[PDB]
Amino acid sequence: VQLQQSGAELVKPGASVKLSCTASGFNIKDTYMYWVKQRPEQGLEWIGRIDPANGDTKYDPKFQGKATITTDTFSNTAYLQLSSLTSEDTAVYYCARKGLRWAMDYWGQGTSVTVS
Amino acid sequence: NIVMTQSPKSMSMSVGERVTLSCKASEYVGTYVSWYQQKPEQSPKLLIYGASNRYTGVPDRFTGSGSATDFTLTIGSVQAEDLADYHCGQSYSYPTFGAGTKLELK
Amino acid sequence: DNTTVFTRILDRLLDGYDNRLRPGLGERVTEVKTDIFVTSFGPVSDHDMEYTIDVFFRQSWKDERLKFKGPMTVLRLNNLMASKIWTPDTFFHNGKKSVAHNMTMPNKLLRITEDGTLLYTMRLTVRAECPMHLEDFPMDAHACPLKFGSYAYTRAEVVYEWTREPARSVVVAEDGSRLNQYDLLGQTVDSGIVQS
Amino acid sequence: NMSLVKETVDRLLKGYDIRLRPDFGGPPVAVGMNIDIASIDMVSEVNMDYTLTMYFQQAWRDKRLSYNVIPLNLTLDNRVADQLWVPDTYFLNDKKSFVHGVTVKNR
Amino acid sequence: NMSLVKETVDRLLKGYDIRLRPDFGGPPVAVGMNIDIASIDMVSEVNMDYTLTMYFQQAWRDKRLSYNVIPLNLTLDNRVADQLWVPDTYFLNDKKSFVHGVTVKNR
Amino acid sequence: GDVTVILNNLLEGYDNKLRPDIGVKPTLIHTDMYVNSIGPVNAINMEYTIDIFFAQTWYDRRLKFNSTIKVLRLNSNMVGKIWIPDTFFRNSKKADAHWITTPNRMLRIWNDGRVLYTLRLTIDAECQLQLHNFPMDEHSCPLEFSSYGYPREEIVYQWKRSSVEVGDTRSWRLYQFSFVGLRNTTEVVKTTSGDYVVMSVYFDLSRRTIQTYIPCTLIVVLSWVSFWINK
Ligand SMILES: *[C@@H]1O[C@H](CO)[C@@H](O[C@@H]2O[C@H](CO)[C@@H](O[C@@H]3O[C@H](CO[C@H]4O[C@H](CO[C@H]5O[C@H](CO)[C@@H](O)[C@H](O)[C@@H]5O)[C@@H](O)[C@H](O[C@H]5O[C@H](CO)[C@@H](O)[C@H](O)[C@@H]5O)[C@@H]4O)[C@@H](O)[C@H](O[C@H]4O[C@H](CO)[C@@H](O)[C@H](O)[C@@H]4O[C@H]4O[C@H](CO)[C@@H](O)[C@H](O)[C@@H]4O)[C@@H]3O)[C@H](O)[C@H]2NC(C)=O)[C@H](O)[C@H]1NC(C)=O
Ligand SMILES: *[C@@H]1O[C@H](CO)[C@@H](O[C@@H]2O[C@H](CO)[C@@H](O[C@@H]3O[C@H](CO[C@H]4O[C@H](CO)[C@@H](O)[C@H](O)[C@@H]4O)[C@@H](O)[C@H](O[C@H]4O[C@H](CO)[C@@H](O)[C@H](O)[C@@H]4O)[C@@H]3O)[C@H](O)[C@H]2NC(C)=O)[C@H](O)[C@H]1NC(C)=O
Ligand SMILES: CCOC(=O)c1ncn2c1CN(C)C(=O)c1cc(F)ccc1-2
Ligand SMILES: *[C@@H]1O[C@H](CO)[C@@H](O)[C@H](O)[C@H]1NC(C)=O
Ligand SMILES: *[C@@H]1O[C@H](CO)[C@@H](O)[C@H](O)[C@H]1NC(C)=O
């Protein structure tokens, strides 16, 4: 149902930042978790996918190695870690759930990360 | 990777007129194409999952229809608050998203 | 007594459990996750317009009445208990004569996790049929389908979804395929709705 | 709800005598049959027989299986048909015929 | 004596829970197989299959079926196979297989 | 009235899994079969069909009722309860018993043990076929049966006085061969489990293409009539 994320993040290049979306109203071990990033006024783009039960994670080859997705099943939270940040990485990040034919029925609020 | 092509890029229509959108898919995607509605400075919602299926809580003026590659989102009686960005997204494979269509009233 | 604990846990789990009622009969709908692993794409026969297949059919649904608390957190149960709990029926719309194997015992494993998530795989050999268009013979290309759906359950009660990403669900073995004339090319998946 | 249905089914199928067809003393029971044909495989003049595969359906009215608590249409698992009554209908001209058993019996 | 063996078997098969393999929590069980091919009937190139008839044996160690009263080699009837545990073992490639039923199920 | 009492007394405190006399000298099963017909014999498949009426007898100390009723017949509904010896045909390829109306089985319990158990069968056996002896060829088709789970120390077979019969030899449907002789032998065979007493009954047969090669040579020789015709 409701998905909660963290607040805004402002960080200088060369530092790791950790974003988190905390699920609520449903058990995370049922469905996958997605991560979509959106620059200002562009098409949505896929970052990675995590499966809380097994642990398998697959990433977009253009982002593979840059971002690592881990989950804490007991606290019911999905974590996104960014590394090797550059100036052009400034964009909004979204947390997503799978449901009803792989359609991303619920979306988070959206976290704004600015690198400079 | 699968690439989605969307047209028209940006068009404007009057109030209460029929509106047709299209999203072309290069590879095969059999009826696993969803349509998202992103209003300015909000979180994208869901309108159509699969094809010609309406997510709950959605007005009836939104209809879809699709095939192996062709897809079409046809709005009915366009209201006043139907100005936003519509994204065509497929999930046959690792999900990708279209360029996005921007809709403004006139 | 290593077994006295597990026998208690596994008798209490079946106490008052009515196998005739699918989970959530008036509550939210059930969702059966499916997968297929083709062992060998059998010999296509031109005369009968049929083709044989040998799949490791799998199913995974969430049943809340079976959850518990124990040390193992995964139960690798025998092939006998699979008939005492609910198991969704799934026939093949275009199957002429399918057979389930019981080589030395029925080939059905049941894995009840701690949350309540099940896995219930089988082994099948299916003589499905497919219509052929021989107008381009011998240079023709066929598309022989395999359509497995629920039975006795409408769309409002049981809904199938592929376990993994639909492109990667139907997996085929590397050396398992055997064909004299034809040559397997690729797999394609698609979900629909059929009214009867 | 889930608790009502269990006790309802339990009290229906308790004391239900399978050997006696409904309305045993009085009028006959109306069994209405409906057929949906899927395919007619082959026609062989050597043996003078044709093979068909059909979805055979038949619905009758039975007062003993009546409940007034739940408005839903109970859909039971196919194991329960061994306990209810079922009108026996045979095909006067058949040589071999079998109910498919792909994953479970198809009824 | 008869009654000694009778009560020994009766106490072996009392409380035996078939759903659990031996040592359900601990280390795995060692199952040793032993095949005795009787005869290979036919080998075809059209269907690419070959039929063989064999004697299939296999022996494991089950700590629950232990007795120290009678020194004999207890050989029960073939019905007890339904009540004891037996490891499932399927053949990865077999189009049709069965167990001969001449006068009783041969096991 | 009283027969129900006798049966309920016999079945109380009776254990099915254990053969009679488990701790002492082994049971001695007598065997006697009656051949009804011999199916078609073919040389290609190297097999043949037979239809017999297998019948075997063994004492049993637990069925020792005492009453005025000398003998009680029983329908086949009783076979499942009392002990029944496993006996398979080593030479069988595909064997099936008959249940045309009901299970075809018989059971007769005399006064002091001595169960009788007979049942119909239909067997397909591999017959070692040799053809060089022709015109003096004499094929022998074996049929050898033995226990499956019991060593020599726990079960022993033995034939009766005659123990083999035949009937209606004219209507045995076999064409290329002809029934001649019949013999019986007993052996001991060692296998993985131990030693099994292997009964064996095998009876001989004699033989009585050439009708098809003639039309080909005839046309060959007849085509030559062209040559001596004038050019
Ligand atoms: C893998 O799966 C398949 C199918 O899923 C398994 O096949 C099934 O195997 C089981 C286990 O043995 C069989 O159950 C038993 O079958 C025997 C013999 O079956 C004969 O008759 C069959 C029909 O059964 C009867 O009922 C119908 C009803 O109309 C009547 O018409 C008949 O006349 C029969 O009376 C028939 O289908 C069989 O043919 C097939 O099987 C043989 C043998 O394998 C093949 O050679 C054939 O080619 C053909 O394929 C066969 O002719 C029955 O006798 C059993 O019933 C008695 O025994 C039980 C246990 O002892 C007992 O609980 C029952 O109550 C009943 O006992 C009654 O009778 C006793 C005397 O005999 C009494 O003492 C007792 O008091 C009681 O009154 C039982 O039914 C299935 O039939 C069989 N199904 C099929 C389709 O083949 C296969 O075995 C599995 N593999 C493995 C490794 O497990
Ligand atoms: C010809 O057509 C007839 C038409 O019915 C078929 O008859 C059916 O045959 C099947 C199998 O032979 C019968 O199924 C058996 O039912 C028994 C009765 O169930 C009792 O026990 C349960 C236990 O929970 C009670 O709930 C219930 O109320 C009954 O009191 C079962 O005991 C049998 O179980 C055995 O097999 C199952 C299979 O998984 C095992 O799990 C068990 O442990 C046990 O070994 C069995 O399920 C069915 O009852 C018959 N119908 C009728 C109306 O009697 C014939 O089978 C068919 N012939 C052929 C060859 O197919
Ligand atoms: C030699 C042992 O013989 C049997 O074991 C036997 N068992 C059953 N029957 C026989 C006898 N026999 C050769 C028959 O044909 C027959 C004919 C009947 F009308 C009724 C029963 C039998
Ligand atoms: C149950 O089936 C009947 C038959 O048509 C239908 O009228 C009724 O609406 C169904 N019940 C529900 C709750 O839909
Ligand atoms: C019982 O079986 C064991 C298995 O090896 C064997 O060593 C032993 O000799 C058998 N008993 C007798 C009395 O032969």
Side-chain angles (χ1 to χ4, degrees):
Chain A
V1 173
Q2 181 179 1
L3 292 174
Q4 185 63 255
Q5 293 183 359
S6 67
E9 293 290 328
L10 181 61
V11 64
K12 292 182 183 292
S16 67
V17 65
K18 187 174 181 180
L19 296 174
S20 66
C21 63
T22 299
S24 66
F26 66 91
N27 193 359
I28 190 169
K29 293 178 71 67
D30 292 332
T31 61
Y32 295 98
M33 300 297 286
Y34 284 98
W35 289 96
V36 174
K37 68 182 291 293
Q38 181 178 2
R39 293 180 182 177
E41 295 296 328
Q42 293 180 358
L44 294 175
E45 184 178 0
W46 181 63
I47 295 171
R49 183 266 298 276
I50 190 167
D51 188 357
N54 293 319
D56 288 330
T57 62
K58 275 73 67 178
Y59 294 99
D60 191 359
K62 65 179 73 174
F63 292 165
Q64 186 175 2
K66 184 177 179 180
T68 301
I69 300 171
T70 62
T71 185
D72 188 0
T73 61
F74 293 100
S75 66
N76 192 357
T77 302
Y79 294 100
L80 176 59
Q81 182 178 2
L82 290 172
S83 65
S84 297
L85 292 175
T86 62
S87 66
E88 291 181 353
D89 192 75
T90 299
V92 180
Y93 292 97
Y94 289 99
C95 181
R97 188 181 70 87
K98 182 265 287 182
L100 294 175
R101 292 179 185 270
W102 303 90
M104 290 72 257
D105 62 356
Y106 292 102
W107 290 82
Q109 281 71 241
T111 301
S112 179
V113 174
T114 301
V115 175
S116 179
Chain B
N1 192 0
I2 297 170
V3 175
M4 300 301 288
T5 300
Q6 185 175 2
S7 296
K9 182 63 68 178
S10 66
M11 59 85 209
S12 179
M13 297 300 291
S14 295
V15 177
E17 292 180 353
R18 185 177 177 88
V19 174
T20 298
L21 285 75
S22 67
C23 184
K24 181 63 67 69
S26 66
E27 291 291 329
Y28 179 82
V29 289
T31 65
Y32 288 104
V33 171
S34 66
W35 291 90
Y36 299 103
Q37 181 181 2
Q38 183 180 3
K39 292 181 181 180
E41 292 179 354
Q42 291 182 357
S43 66
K45 292 174 70 175
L46 182 64
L47 294 179
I48 305 300
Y49 62 91
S52 67
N53 294 114
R54 291 188 296 273
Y55 186 78
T56 187
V58 172
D60 292 331
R61 62 183 182 271
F62 293 104
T63 60
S65 66
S67 178
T69 62
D70 290 331
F71 297 100
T72 299
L73 176 59
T74 298
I75 301 169
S77 178
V78 58
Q79 298 294 322
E81 70 275 17
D82 290 331
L83 62 91
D85 293 332
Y86 295 100
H87 298 285
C88 62
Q90 62 86 28
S91 65
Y92 180 79
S93 180
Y94 296 99
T96 188
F97 291 90
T101 300
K102 187 173 176 66
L103 190 152
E104 184 178 1
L105 296 176
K106 183 175 87 275
Chain C
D1 289 330
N2 296 114
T3 60
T4 301
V5 174
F6 294 100
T7 300
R8 290 178 180 175
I9 294 171
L10 192 60
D11 286 331
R12 183 178 294 170
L13 184 148
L14 290 175
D15 191 0
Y17 183 75
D18 193 359
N19 59 5
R20 290 186 297 273
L21 277 68
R22 55 96 168 173
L25 186 60
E27 296 180 355
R28 85 290 185 276
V29 304
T30 188
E31 186 172 0
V32 171
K33 296 181 177 68
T34 308
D35 189 358
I36 291 172
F37 181 81
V38 173
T39 298
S40 67
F41 188 78
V44 176
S45 179
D46 290 329
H47 293 88
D48 295 332
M49 291 181 182
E50 71 181 3
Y51 72 97
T52 302
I53 194 166
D54 188 355
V55 300
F56 269 59
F57 193 79
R58 304 180 195 153
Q59 292 178 357
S60 176
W61 64 94
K62 186 176 185 293
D63 190 357
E64 186 177 1
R65 297 176 295 174
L66 293 174
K67 68 182 180 181
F68 63 93
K69 184 179 287 293
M72 288 300 293
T73 66
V74 170
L75 293 174
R76 294 178 178 89
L77 296 175
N78 196 0
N79 308 118
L80 295 175
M81 185 174 175
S83 68
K84 292 181 181 179
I85 64 169
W86 184 70
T87 60
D89 54 356
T90 301
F91 77 96
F92 295 180
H93 290 282
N94 61 6
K96 287 174 69 175
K97 180 174 174 64
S98 296
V99 59
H101 289 94
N102 55 356
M103 181 53 212
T104 62
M105 289 176 69
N107 305 120
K108 298 190 266 77
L109 83 80
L110 183 63
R111 296 180 187 274
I112 295 171
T113 62
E114 182 177 1
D115 192 1
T117 299
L118 279 73
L119 184 66
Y120 178 78
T121 136
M122 299 181 74
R123 187 172 69 89
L124 297 175
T125 294
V126 178
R127 288 177 61 192
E129 69 182 1
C130 63
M132 293 182 182
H133 294 285
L134 296 176
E135 292 177 352
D136 294 332
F137 183 78
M139 298 172 68
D140 58 356
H142 296 92
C144 289
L146 182 63
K147 291 188 262 74
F148 63 96
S150 177
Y151 190 71
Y153 294 105
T154 64
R155 187 184 67 190
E157 294 179 351
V158 175
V159 175
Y160 287 159
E161 292 295 329
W162 296 101
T163 300
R164 289 187 296 272
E165 297 174 354
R168 291 177 63 193
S169 293
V170 178
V171 178
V172 62
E174 292 182 353
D175 60 356
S177 177
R178 69 268 190 103
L179 288 172
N180 296 115
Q181 294 177 355
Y182 293 163
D183 192 359
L184 185 62
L185 189 62
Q187 292 82 15
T188 298
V189 299
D190 186 0
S191 297
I193 292 170
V194 173
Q195 184 176 1
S196 66
Chain D
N1 191 357
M2 186 65 201
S3 296
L4 294 174
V5 180
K6 184 179 184 294
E7 66 182 1
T8 300
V9 173
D10 285 331
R11 68 174 176 85
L12 289 176
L13 276 69
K14 181 174 70 67
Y16 182 76
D17 196 359
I18 187 168
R19 292 183 296 274
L20 279 70
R21 57 96 177 176
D23 292 331
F24 187 76
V29 63
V31 172
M33 287 184 282
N34 186 358
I35 291 172
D36 188 0
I37 292 170
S39 67
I40 294 172
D41 292 330
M42 66 183 289
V43 172
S44 178
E45 296 87 3
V46 176
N47 293 317
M48 291 181 182
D49 58 354
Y50 68 95
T51 295
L52 62 85
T53 298
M54 59 182 176
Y55 296 172
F56 187 76
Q57 298 182 0
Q58 55 186 354
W60 65 92
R61 186 177 183 273
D62 189 356
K63 293 180 182 179
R64 293 175 294 175
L65 296 175
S66 178
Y67 59 92
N68 291 318
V69 177
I70 300 93
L72 294 176
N73 287 318
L74 294 175
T75 299
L76 297 174
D77 190 72
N78 60 5
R79 293 178 182 89
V80 74
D82 290 329
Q83 296 177 357
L84 298 178
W85 186 69
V86 286
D88 51 354
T89 67
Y90 73 103
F91 299 169
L92 185 65
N93 55 3
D94 60 353
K95 292 167 70 174
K96 292 175 93 291
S97 66
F98 62 96
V99 177
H100 296 287
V102 177
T103 59
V104 300
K105 292 183 75 68
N106 300 116
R107 68 180 183 270
Chain E
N1 192 359
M2 185 66 201
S3 294
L4 291 174
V5 179
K6 182 179 183 293
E7 68 182 1
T8 297
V9 175
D10 288 330
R11 69 180 66 191
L12 289 176
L13 275 69
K14 184 176 180 180
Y16 186 77
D17 194 359
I18 189 169
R19 293 185 297 272
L20 280 73
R21 57 94 172 171
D23 295 331
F24 181 72
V29 62
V31 172
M33 291 171 62
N34 189 356
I35 297 172
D36 188 0
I37 294 171
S39 67
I40 296 170
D41 291 331
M42 65 182 288
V43 175
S44 177
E45 295 89 3
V46 177
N47 292 319
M48 290 182 181
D49 60 353
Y50 68 97
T51 297
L52 63 89
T53 298
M54 64 182 178
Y55 295 169
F56 187 77
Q57 295 182 358
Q58 56 187 355
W60 60 92
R61 185 177 181 273
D62 190 358
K63 291 183 180 180
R64 293 189 297 272
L65 299 176
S66 179
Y67 60 93
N68 292 319
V69 177
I70 296 92
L72 294 174
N73 302 102
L74 290 176
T75 301
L76 300 175
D77 195 0
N78 61 4
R79 290 181 181 90
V80 71
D82 290 330
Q83 297 179 358
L84 295 176
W85 183 71
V86 290
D88 54 354
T89 298
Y90 76 111
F91 299 166
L92 189 66
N93 50 5
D94 55 352
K95 295 171 71 173
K96 288 172 92 289
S97 295
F98 63 95
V99 176
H100 293 284
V102 176
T103 62
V104 297
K105 285 182 93 290
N106 298 118
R107 73 264 195 98
Chain F
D2 290 332
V3 176
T4 301
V5 176
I6 297 170
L7 291 174
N8 291 320
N9 288 319
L10 291 176
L11 271 292
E12 182 179 1
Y14 184 76
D15 191 73
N16 303 322
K17 300 177 290 294
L18 277 69
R19 66 178 178 86
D21 300 332
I22 188 66
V24 298
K25 293 181 182 179
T27 62
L28 187 63
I29 284 87
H30 299 286
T31 304
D32 172 12
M33 83 175 63
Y34 168 121
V35 174
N36 192 0
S37 69
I38 298 171
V41 179
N42 54 3
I44 297 170
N45 295 114
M46 188 179 287
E47 56 86 19
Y48 71 98
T49 297
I50 193 169
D51 186 358
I52 66 171
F53 275 64
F54 190 76
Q56 55 187 353
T57 302
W58 64 93
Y59 285 171
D60 191 357
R61 298 294 181 185
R62 295 173 293 176
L63 281 72
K64 192 180 289 293
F65 64 92
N66 188 359
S67 68
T68 64
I69 295 92
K70 180 64 70 177
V71 182
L72 72 160
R73 288 90 163 96
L74 288 174
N75 194 359
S76 68
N77 288 319
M78 189 65 206
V79 174
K81 294 181 183 293
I82 68 167
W83 185 63
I84 56 170
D86 52 352
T87 297
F88 74 101
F89 297 170
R90 290 183 184 272
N91 205 165
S92 176
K93 287 174 68 176
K94 183 263 290 180
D96 287 329
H98 293 329
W99 341 63
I100 292 175
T101 278
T102 66
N104 285 164
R105 269 104 188 275
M106 189 192 74
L107 189 66
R108 294 178 186 271
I109 298 167
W110 276 274
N111 192 0
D112 53 355
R114 188 172 184 266
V115 177
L116 179 63
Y117 176 72
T118 189
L119 77 165
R120 190 171 188 177
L121 293 175
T122 296
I123 300 94
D124 186 359
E126 292 178 353
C127 182
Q128 182 64 39
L129 294 173
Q130 61 184 356
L131 295 173
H132 180 73
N133 291 318
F134 185 78
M136 294 175 70
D137 55 355
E138 295 180 355
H139 295 88
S140 66
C141 293
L143 183 63
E144 57 186 1
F145 58 90
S146 66
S147 296
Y148 186 70
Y150 296 98
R152 183 180 65 190
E153 292 86 5
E154 291 180 352
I155 194 167
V156 176
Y157 291 100
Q158 182 178 1
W159 293 96
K160 290 183 181 180
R161 281 75 176 270
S162 178
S163 69
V164 175
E165 296 181 356
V166 295
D168 293 329
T169 61
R170 291 179 180 176
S171 66
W172 284 359
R173 195 247 172 272
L174 79 176
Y175 296 106
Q176 299 170 358
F177 297 141
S178 60
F179 187 94
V180 175
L182 185 148
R183 290 181 289 115
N184 51 3
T185 62
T186 66
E187 293 179 353
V188 175
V189 172
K190 182 175 175 66
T191 59
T192 301
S193 297
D195 295 333
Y196 293 160
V197 289
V198 174
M199 294 297 105
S200 179
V201 169
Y202 61 96
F203 51 84
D204 289 330
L205 294 171
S206 67
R207 184 181 293 274
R208 291 179 181 175
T209 301
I210 60 170
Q211 297 297 110
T212 305
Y213 290 165
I214 297 170
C216 205
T217 298
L218 180 66
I219 305 300
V220 172
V221 175
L222 184 60
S223 67
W224 292 351
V225 178
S226 178
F227 295 105
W228 292 275
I229 302 168
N230 293 320
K231 293 186 265 75

